Amino acid sequence: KESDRCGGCGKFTHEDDLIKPLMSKKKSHHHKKNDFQWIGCDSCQTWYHFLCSGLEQFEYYLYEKFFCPKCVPHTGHSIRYKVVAPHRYRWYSPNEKHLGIEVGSKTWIEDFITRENTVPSPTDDEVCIVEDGYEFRREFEKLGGADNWGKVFMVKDMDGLNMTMPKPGFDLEDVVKIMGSDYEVDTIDVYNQSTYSMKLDTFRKLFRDTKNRPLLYNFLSLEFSDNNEMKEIAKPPRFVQEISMVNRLWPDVSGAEYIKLLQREEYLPEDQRPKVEQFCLAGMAGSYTDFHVDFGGSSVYYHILKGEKIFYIAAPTEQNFAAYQAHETSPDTTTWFGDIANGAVKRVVIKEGQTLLIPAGWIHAVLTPVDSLVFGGNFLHLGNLEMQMRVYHLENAIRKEIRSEEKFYFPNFELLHWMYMRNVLLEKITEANQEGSDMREQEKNIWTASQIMKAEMERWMDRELRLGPEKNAILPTDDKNKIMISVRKQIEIQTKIQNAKNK
């Protein structure tokens, strides 16, 4: 406040500062609108921006009495707000002490832990529990394989999944050693249901302090597909790499084969690649993550390297979506979706070493009973194309009813389908025509996937005519049309081929 200057950047209050897109799960870059919002040292009375105060994003709102770096030595560490309303996200404000218990809050979680064990077990149709990756491959295949993947699998022993994972004993320490101590990761302030920045070192610091945890901290994503060391340490199961649409257009390879497979443009621009297939996840015991459907209706692999998780899940039926949509778009904050989900929500525990494989659309919330380290990834695949498009409808509807903009959605979702259609699907059809082949013979799966995907894209084209292109852009209305035109052309030819067999 006032004319006075900043002890950090020496600037007097100017300022009004408007001085590539996100391809990975990030939500902390939003309240950078506070980085230049002035806090004052209760001691030397010097004013600091915030950024300039030595504070990290996550501690901006924590302190009632602030002591800047130059004062800490003799003043002590800054004094935090008193915990006045443990049952509210704004735990610091007394004006909210009388309001209802909010789903994310400390009070709510503690109580929830006493009653959570009464959430029903899933039916054998919802989840399948196998001993190792060999049994998974056998049962997965016995239900139609990836093209027909509908239930979640829990694999107890990772042997056979062909899934590259660090050896037990691997922990947070190794993570910070590899990524660096100054690597900033999006962290969820569980009790405040909000996401902030935090040095990876700071997190480790807080994580290791076991007896004193005023707040709980889990990190959002931490996607490591671009860290040359990490990216080889934990990988998706082979079967996931073999069906991942992103992996099909931006193939992993990145070795000697990379030089060659891009020597034919079989590798799209790296900045266009969705960055969501390899994430590391650490969480404190007592943590809770509220019900969500994974972005783009992406499938998930989820390996527990350390600790235990309890997942609360609900099958992706239309009613369950409708119910979920209402819950997401409602202002109510005190009701647990499970309690109003007409009995759909089930309970499943995942222990250390165990793995979770989740198909498209499953609604799920997560309880973290024990300090945890997890490795996982999100992927799209043709076997779940319909469900993926259904979730995308759901998301797009939810996005119109409440102004999220902080909510993360699948990066380049549409671009990816244009590319996939043009590079992969169109060629199969084009070629199958060049030989007068009836795709139903040996490629029914591919034929059906093309019609479904095309219909969805036809809807995107028309939307783009009536309303104009999207902000997300990246592919030019013209190119989009040329693609569509060519696709219609080939699908017609293949249709006539199929119809000729009529007599």
Site residues for Fe ion per CB under 5 A: 294
Cβ(49)–Cβ(8) below 8 Å:
yes
- Smallest distance, Å, CB 79 to Zn ion? 14
Q: Where does this chain touch Zn ion (CB under 5 A) — which range of 66-74, 109-117, 140-148, 406-414?
A: 66-74
- Smallest distance, Å, CB 292 to Fe ion? 6
- Smallest distance, Å, CB 30 to Zn ion? 20
Residues 6 or more apart in contact with residue 156 via CB below 8 angstroms: 129, 130, 131, 132, 353, 354, 355
Question: Is the CB of 70 or the CB of 80 nearer to Zn ion?
Answer: 70
Position among 5, 31, 38, 71 found at the interface with Zn ion (CB under 5 A):
71
44 binds, among Zn ion, Fe ion, none (CB under 5 to 8 A by kind): Zn ion
- Smallest distance, Å, CB 185 to Zn ion? 24
Q: What is the DSSP string of 106-143?
A: HHHHHHHHHHGGGSPPPPTTTEEEEEEHHHHHHHHHHT
Rounded to 5°, angle at Cα 411 from 188 and 462: 135
189 binds, among Zn ion, Fe ion, none (CB under 5 to 8 A by kind): none
49 binds, among Fe ion, Zn ion, none (CB under 5 to 8 A by kind): Zn ion
- Give the Cα separation of 309 and 331 in Å (integer): 28
Q: List the interface residues with Zn ion, window 35-54 (CB under 5 A).
A: 41, 43-44, 49, 52
Phi/psi at 291 (5° precision): -45, 130
**Structure letter (DSSP) for residue 81:** P
Question: Is the CB of 23 or the CB of 176 nearer to Fe ion?
Answer: 23
- Smallest distance, Å, CB 426 to Fe ion? 32
Question: Is the CB of 60 or the CB of 408 nearer to Fe ion?
Answer: 408
- What residue is closest to Fe ion based on CB? 294
Cβ(307)–Cβ(352) below 8 Å:
yes
Q: Where does this chain touch Zn ion (CB under 5 A) — which range of 67-75, 177-185, 358-366, 466-474?
A: 67-75
Question: Is the CB of 186 or the CB of 294 nearer to Fe ion?
Answer: 294
Binding site members for substrate: 289-294, 302, 309, 364
246 binds, among Fe ion, Zn ion, none (CB under 5 to 8 A by kind): none
Ramachandran class of 265: left when φ > 0, alpha when ψ lies in -120 to 50, beta otherwise = left
- Smallest distance, Å, CB 376 to Fe ion? 8
When asked if residue 165 is in the footprint of Zn ion (CB under 5 A), the reply is no
For residue 104, count other CB atoms closer than 10 A to its CB. Answer: 20
305 binds, among Fe ion, Zn ion, none (CB under 5 to 8 A by kind): none
Question: Is the CB of 220 or the CB of 421 nearer to Fe ion?
Answer: 220
Strand partners, 192: none
8 binds, among Zn ion, Fe ion, none (CB under 5 to 8 A by kind): Zn ion
43 binds, among Fe ion, Zn ion, none (CB under 5 to 8 A by kind): Zn ion
Measured in whole angstroms, how far is the alpha carbon of residue 220 from the centre of its chain? 8
Binding site members: 289-294, 302, 309, 364
68 binds, among Fe ion, Zn ion, none (CB under 5 to 8 A by kind): Zn ion
- Smallest distance, Å, CB 194 to Zn ion? 24
Cβ(207)–Cβ(171) below 8 Å:
no
- Give the Cα separation of 135 and 161 in Å (integer): 9
List the strands of the sheet with 187-189, edge to edge.
194-196, 187-189, 217-219
- Give the Cα separation of 290 and 341 in Å (integer): 14
Question: Is the CB of 43 or the CB of 430 nearer to Zn ion?
Answer: 43
Position among 55, 62, 68, 425 found at the interface with Zn ion (CB under 5 A):
68
H or E segment at 330? none
Strand partners, 132: 157
Select from 180, 30, 163, 190 the least CA-distant residue to 105: 190
Binding site members for Fe cation: 292, 294, 364
Q: Where does this chain touch Zn ion (CB under 5 A) — which range of 68-76, 163-171, 391-399, 411-419?
A: 68-76
Question: Is the CB of 77 or the CB of 211 nearer to Zn ion?
Answer: 77
- Give the Cα separation of 279 and 360 in Å (integer): 18
- Smallest distance, Å, CB 187 to Zn ion? 24
The shares of helix, strand and coil residues in the chain, as percent rounded to the nearest 5, are 40, 20, 40
79 binds, among Fe ion, Zn ion, none (CB under 5 to 8 A by kind): none
H-state helical runs in 209-357: 230-233, 238-241, 245-249, 256-261, 318-329
83 binds, among Zn ion, Fe ion, none (CB under 5 to 8 A by kind): none
Binding-site size for Zn ion (CB under 5 A) equals: 10
Select from 96, 301, 56 the least CA-distant residue to 181: 56
Q: What is the DSSP string of 271-334?
A: GGS---S-EEEEE-TTEEEEEE--GGG-EEEEEEEEEEEEEEEE---HHHHHHHHHHHH----S
Select from 464, 488, 497 the least CA-distant residue to 478: 464
Structure tokens at 333: 């904050």
- Smallest distance, Å, CB 313 to Fe ion? 10
- Smallest distance, Å, CB 33 to Zn ion? 15
Cβ(191)–Cβ(105) below 8 Å:
yes
Question: Is the CB of 42 or the CB of 308 nearer to Zn ion?
Answer: 42
Question: Is the CB of 39 or the CB of 367 nearer to Zn ion?
Answer: 39
Question: Is the CB of 71 or the CB of 143 nearer to Zn ion?
Answer: 71
Structure tokens at 21: 């897109």
Residues that bind Zn ion (CB under 5 A): 6, 8-9, 41, 43-44, 49, 52, 68, 71
